[PDB]
Amino acid sequence: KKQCGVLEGLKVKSEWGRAYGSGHDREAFSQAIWRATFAQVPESRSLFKRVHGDDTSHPAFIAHADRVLGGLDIAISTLDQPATLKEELDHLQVQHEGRKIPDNYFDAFKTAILHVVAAQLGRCYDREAWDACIDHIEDGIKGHH
């Protein structure tokens, strides 16, 4: 419904700043997001068997989560520097290719992020914009569309 251009980027980049937050808000923000993801596609829990995906509250996984958002941060935080973003995305792309991750999961994970972010930002939050950008970021990790 909209493309992750210049402005829509700045908007998401800014709003993400508020939603991401820090400290505990973060440790939860991520928590919430994953719970929402796994709730959608329980099938995916099997991929994070290595990092205690069975118990979303296990430190190992907490780390993992907080670690994942980390990348998403770099991604979003550079939607205004195609040059660099390109690189980060590509880097991620690698850490993921090889794992049989269906476009099905990414979809759920996006939804998760969106719902949580919306819950966190209360009122000031453009859905289309995020959708568009989270998409562009995910595409850069899958290689597809």
Partner 1 sequence: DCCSYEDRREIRHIWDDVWSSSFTDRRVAIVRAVFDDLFKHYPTSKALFERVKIDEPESGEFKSHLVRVANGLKLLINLLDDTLVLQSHLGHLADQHIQRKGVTKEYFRGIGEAFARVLPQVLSCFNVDAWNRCFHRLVARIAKDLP
Partner 2 sequence: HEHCCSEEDHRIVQKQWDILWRDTESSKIKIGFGRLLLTKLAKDIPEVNDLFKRVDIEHAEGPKFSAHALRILNGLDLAINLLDDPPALDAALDHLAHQHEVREGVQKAHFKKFGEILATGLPQVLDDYDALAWKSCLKGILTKISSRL
Partner 3 sequence: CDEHEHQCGGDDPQCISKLFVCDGHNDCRNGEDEKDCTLPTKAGDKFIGDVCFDHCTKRRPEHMTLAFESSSIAAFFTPIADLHVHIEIESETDEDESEVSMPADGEYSFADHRLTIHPPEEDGLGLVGEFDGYNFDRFVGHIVHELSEEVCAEFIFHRKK
d(CA 141, CA 92): 6
If the CB atoms of residues 60 and 119 are measured against ligand HEM, the closer one turns out to be 60
Give 65 or 85: the residue with its C-beta nearer to partner 1: 85
Please provide the distance, in angstroms rounded to a whole number, between the alpha carbons at the two ends of the chain: 15
Angle at which helices 7-20 and 127-142 cross, to 10°:
90
Q: Which residues bind partner 2 (CB under 8 A)?
A: 13-14, 17, 22-24, 26-27, 59-60, 62-63, 66-67, 70, 73-74, 77-78, 80-81, 83-84, 86-88, 91, 100, 102-105, 107, 142-145
Question: To the nearest whole angstrom, how small is the minimum distance from the Cβ of residue 119 to partner 2?
Answer: 20
Q: Which of 12, 10, 6, 5 is nearest to 127 (CA)?
A: 12
Query: In terms of Cα–Cα distance, which of 107, 116, 105, 101 is closest to 69?
Result: 116
Give the interface with ligand HEM as residue ranges (CB under 6 A): 44, 47-48, 50-51, 67-68, 71-72, 75, 92, 95-96, 99, 101, 105-106, 109, 137-138, 141
